[PDB]
Amino acid sequence: GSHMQDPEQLKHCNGILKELLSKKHAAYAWPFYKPVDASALGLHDYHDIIKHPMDLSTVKRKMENRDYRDAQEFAADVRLMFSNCYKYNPPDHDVVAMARKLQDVFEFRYAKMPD
Numbered sequence: 868g869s870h871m872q873d874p875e876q877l878k879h880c881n882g883i884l885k886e887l888l889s890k891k892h893a894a895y896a897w898p899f900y901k902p903v904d905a906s907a908l909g910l911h912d913y914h915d916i917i918k919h920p921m922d923l924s925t926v927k928r929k930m931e932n933r934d935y936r937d938a939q940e941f942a943a944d945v946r947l948m949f950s951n952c953y954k955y956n957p958p959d960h961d962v963v964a965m966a967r968k969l970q971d972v973f974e975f976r977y978a979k980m981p982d
């Protein structure tokens with residue numbers, strides 16, 4: 868059920884999203900900007916391993932469309948995006964190091980949620 872604080876919490880989420888997409892973090896955020904194009908990357912098993920793809924452009928579309936009803940729903944998609952990366956790729960891959968850095972940005976700012 869909607870809480871009177873959900874709009875303000877969603878503004879905090881939108882601020883986080885803008886930060887994740889900003890030039891400040893682009894050196895490690897870029898793999899997460901768009902859906903994984905498995906065929907283009909030669910990763911022909913990606914959709915057999917990853918049931919629910921997620922990426923920041925999809926999060927942005929969902930925010931713009933008012934799909935997220937609360938902060939926890941937004942956070943679940945951001946964390947799904949990172950989890951997919953940790954599931955599919957070897958833990959020493961460059962993309963995993965990038966994911967860990969971007970997830971640190973996310974988690975520390977998400978923790979500052981007004982509540």
Ligand SMILES: CC(=O)N1c2ccc(-c3cc[nH]n3)cc2[C@H](Nc2ccc(C#N)cc2)C[C@@H]1C
Nearest residue numbers: 897898899903904908910951952955956961962
């Ligand atoms: C997010 C994610 O898990 N993945 C993902 C997604 C998009 C893109 C992409 C976008 C444009 N081009 N490539 C590349 C990758 C990863 N591959 C690499 C990532 C970083 C580096 C360096 N430094 C080298 C390879 C493979 C992996 C399936």
